């Protein structure tokens, strides 16, 4: 139910992961080390986050695993955009890791991704995304991935959840008091941005799968596991 669902998502928010710039000037290698070390740690905390969304741990193990494998980069990115919303031209990876757009020139292929993330962030800024709409949208990203049957009631349980989260978002938007028609347009504007997040996600994934090839960066643990696919 919408108020309680929203409070749960609020209380589910993962901690801020702290990381610092290296002492030496960035290289392609050291910038990627910093971003993947951060991503790996935020991944750890993402699992605990997903587990606190009501109903998530009631889905089957395969379903839990499969939504997380499908959405993790989107969720990393969405949390990054939220952190950065108030800071045009910057990506707020952590309090002490704030990259200027031009810093992406440091790593082949990463400027484009920064630009996509920065543009999606400006669109959220222009829409004046509220905290509670961000909570619902981030949870929607977790729950809204293709599933096509796997061969292994979980799927109806998934639909009910996503339903409830989409209801919660509609409910949040109703608070603004705007016209019925403007409430529909804001919902549409928000959800249409889900494609941009998936699209940046795809470029991020491909970037990291390729880096891992080039041994431009060693990757570890949870992050390496998620990438191994």
């Amino acid at each position: 139910s919408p108020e309680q669902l929203v409070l749960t998502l609020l209380e589910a928010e993962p901690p801020h992961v702290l990381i610092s710039r290296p002492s030496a000037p960035f290289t392609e290698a050291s910038m990627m080390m910093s971003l993947t070390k951060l991503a790996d740690k935020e991944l750890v905390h993402m699992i605990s986050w997903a587990k606190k969304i009501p109903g998530f741990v009631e889905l089957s193990l395969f379903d839990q695993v499969r939504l997380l494998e499908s959405c993790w980069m989107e969720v990393l990115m969405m949390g990054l955009m939220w952190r950065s919303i108030d800071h045009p031209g910057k990506l707020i990876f952590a309090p002490d890791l704030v990259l200027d757009r031009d810093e992406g020139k440091c790593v082949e292929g990463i400027l484009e991704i920064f630009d996509m993330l920065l543009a999606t962030t400006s669109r959220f800024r222009e829409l004046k995304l509220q905290h509670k709409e961000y909570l619902c949208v981030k949870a929607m990203i977790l729950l809204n991935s293709s599933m096509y049957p796997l061969v292994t009631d979980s799927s109806r349980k998934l639909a009910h959840l996503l339903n409830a989260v989409t209801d919660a978002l509609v409910w949040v938007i109703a608070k603004s008091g705007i016209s019925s028609q403007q409430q529909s347009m804001r919902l549409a504007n928000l959800l249409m941005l889900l494609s941009h997040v998936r699209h940046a996600s795809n470029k991020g994934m491909e970037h990291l799968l390729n880096m891992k090839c080039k041994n431009v960066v060693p990757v570890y643990d949870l992050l390496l596991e998620m990438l191994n696919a």
């Binding site: 750890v44 699992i47 605990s48 587990k51 193990l61 695993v65 494998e69 596991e225 191994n228």
Partner: peptide, 10 residues
């Protein structure tokens, strides 16, 4: 394969 994820979920 999800040797670690399975671990953190369960």
């Amino acid at each position: 394969r999800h040797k670690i994820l399975h671990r953190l979920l369960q």
